C-alpha cells in the first residue's frame, strides 16, 4: 500500500522577481527530497539519511526537472492571472500534487495528479490517466490545451513506469525506516475544565505510518475533538482525540486506537 | 524521481 508523491508550490511575488517555487518528495509519510528556488544555485537535495548514497547523476537530473517545473509554473501563474482577469500586483498560488500507489502485490495500483489555483481544485488528471479535466469553468482552456498537447500521456507513462520503478528503488534504500511499522504508545490524560466537566484526552505517540483512527465510546452507548496529526520530528507522528465528559463519570468512557502496526484495535480507559 | 514534464495550463 506504499506511495511515491511530490507536492509542488509556486507563489508569484510581483516586483520581487521570479515566483517562489518549492518541491517536496514523500515515500509514504517520509519526506526524502526537496527543491527550493530561494537560494543562489537552487538544487534538489536529500531530506532523508538513506538518500545521501545517490550520485551527482540523480541530483543534477532532479535539479533540472525541478528547475523546468519552476519555469513552467512561472508561465502557468501568468496564464492563470490572465484567465481570472486578476491584477499583476497580487500574489497567487499554484499547487501541483502527483503520486503513484502500489497494491498488496507490489504492482502499480493507481496514479493521480491535481493542480489548484489559490487553494481551489483547478485541473484534475482523470482516473484512467488518459486526459486532464477542468473542475470549474475557468480551467476549460487548460483542459483544451493539455489534451491538444496530450499532457495526460506523458504524466501516465511517468505514474505507471518511472514513478513505480523509483518507488521500489526508494523502498529498498532505507527499508530499515520505510518498511518498519511503529505502533502508537497510547495513554489517557484527565483535564478538569470546569466544576461539572473534565476533558479526557486519548494520546497516540511516536507511530508510523501517519494513518490512525482515534474514537471515544461510552459504556451502554460520541462527540470528539480530533487534533491534526503532527510530526514528532524524528519521522514518527503524534495525535490525540479529546471528549468533554461530566466530572466523576470519566471511567464510563473508552478510547479505541486502530493502527497498521497494532495486531488488533487497542481499547484504553482512564484510571484515577 | 520527478516527472521530466510539468503540465502547461
Amino acid at each position, epitope marked *: 500500500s506504499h506511495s511515491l508523491k511530490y507536492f509542488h508550490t509556486s507563489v508569484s511575488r510581483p516586483g520581487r522577481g521570479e515566483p517562489r517555487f518549492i518541491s517536496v518528495g514523500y515515500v509514504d509519510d517520509t519526506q526524502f527530497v526537496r527543491f527550493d528556488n530561494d537560494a543562489a544555485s537552487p538544487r534538489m537535495v536529500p531530506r532523508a539519511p538513506w538518500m545521501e548514497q545517490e550520485g551527482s547523476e540523480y541530483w543534477d537530473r532532479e535539479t533540472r526537472s525541478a528547475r523546468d517545473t519552476a519555469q513552467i509554473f*512561472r508561465v502557468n501563474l501568468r496564464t492563470l492571472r490572465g484567465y481570472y482577469n486578476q491584477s499583476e500586483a497580487g500574489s497567487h498560488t499554484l499547487q501541483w500534487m502527483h503520486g503513484c500507489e502500489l497494491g498488496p502485490d507490489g504492482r502499480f495500483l493507481r496514479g493521480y495528479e491535481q493542480c489548484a489555483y489559490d487553494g481551489k481544485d483547478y485541473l484534475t488528471l482523470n482516473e484512467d490517466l488518459r486526459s486532464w479535466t477542468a473542475v470549474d469553468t475557468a480551467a476549460q482552456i487548460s483542459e483544451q490545451k493539455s489534451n491538444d498537447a496530450s499532457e495526460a500521456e506523458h504524466q501516465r507513462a511517468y505514474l505507471e513506469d518511472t514513478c513505480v520503478e523509483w518507488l521500489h528503488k526508494y523502498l529498498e534504500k532505507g527499508k530499515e525506516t520505510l518498511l518498519h511499522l511503529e505502533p502508537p504508545k497510547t495513554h489517557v490524560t484527565h483535564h478538569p475544565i470546569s466544576d461539572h466537566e473534565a476533558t479526557l484526552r486519548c494520546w497516540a505517540l511516536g507511530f508510523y505510518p501517519a494513518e490512525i483512527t482515534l474514537t471515544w465510546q461510552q459504556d451502554g452507548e460520541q462527540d470528539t475533538e480530533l487534533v491534526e496529526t503532527r510530526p514528532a520530528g524524528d519521522g514518527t507522528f503524534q495525535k490525540w482525540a479529546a471528549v468533554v465528559v461530566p466530572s466523576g463519570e470519566e471511567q464510563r468512557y473508552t478510547c479505541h486506537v486502530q493502527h497498521e502496526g497494532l495486531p488488533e484495535p487497542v481499547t484504553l480507559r482512564w484510571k484515577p | 524521481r520527478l516527472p521530466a514534464k510539468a503540465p502547461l495550463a
Partner: T-cell receptor
Amino acid sequence: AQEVTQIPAALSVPEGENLVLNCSFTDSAIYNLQWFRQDPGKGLTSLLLIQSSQREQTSGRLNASLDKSSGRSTLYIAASQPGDSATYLCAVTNQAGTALIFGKGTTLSVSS
Amino acid sequence: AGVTQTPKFQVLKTGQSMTLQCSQDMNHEYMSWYRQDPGMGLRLIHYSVGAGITDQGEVPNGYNVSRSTTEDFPLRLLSAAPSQTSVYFCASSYSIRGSRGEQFFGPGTRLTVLE
C-alpha cells in the same frame, strides 16, 4: 538529455527514385517531431510537423511517419527531383517540452 | 516579416564582445538560439518560454541572452573565441507542445572570430 540521430548523414540518389531520410530519438516522451529543409546559406523552413498523437503527415511527395515506441520517424521522398537537393534536419521536443533538439541533418543530393 | 536577424555576416577579434540581434513580430512566447557547424547540425545555446524567462541549452558556455520583450531575443558573446566561429540561427514558435508547433528560423548570422 534528448538525443537525435539522422541516418544517413549524406545521400546521393538518381532523380526519379524513392528514398527514406531517417530520424531516431533516445527519449520517446516527445510532444512534436518536425522535419526542416535548409538550402545553402539559408535558414530552416518547416516541411512537416507530427504531433505525438498523430502517426503520419503528408506534403506532396513527402510523407513523414512517427513511431514513438521504436522512437523514430521515416521521411519518405517519392519520385525524387533535383529540386529536393538540400540539407534535411529533424527536431523533437527536449525532455522539459520547452525547446526543440536537432539532429546533425541528412544532406540529400538528387543527381540530375 | 517572420524572424529577423542582424548582422548577416560579422568578423570579430578574440576577446571582443558582440550582440547578435533577433526579432519576431508574430507574438511567439517561445524563442531559441542555435549554432550550426559542419556535420554538427543545430545545437541549442539558450531558449526562452516567455518575456523575462530564459534558460541554458546544450552548449550555453560563452553566451548570454535577454528576453526583455516578446519581440527581442538578443544573443551576447561576452568575450569572442575562435571556437565561437559558427552560423547562429534564432528561432520562434507559437507553441512547443501543441498542434501550432511550426518553428520559424531567421536567415542566420555567419560569425568568424580571429586572433
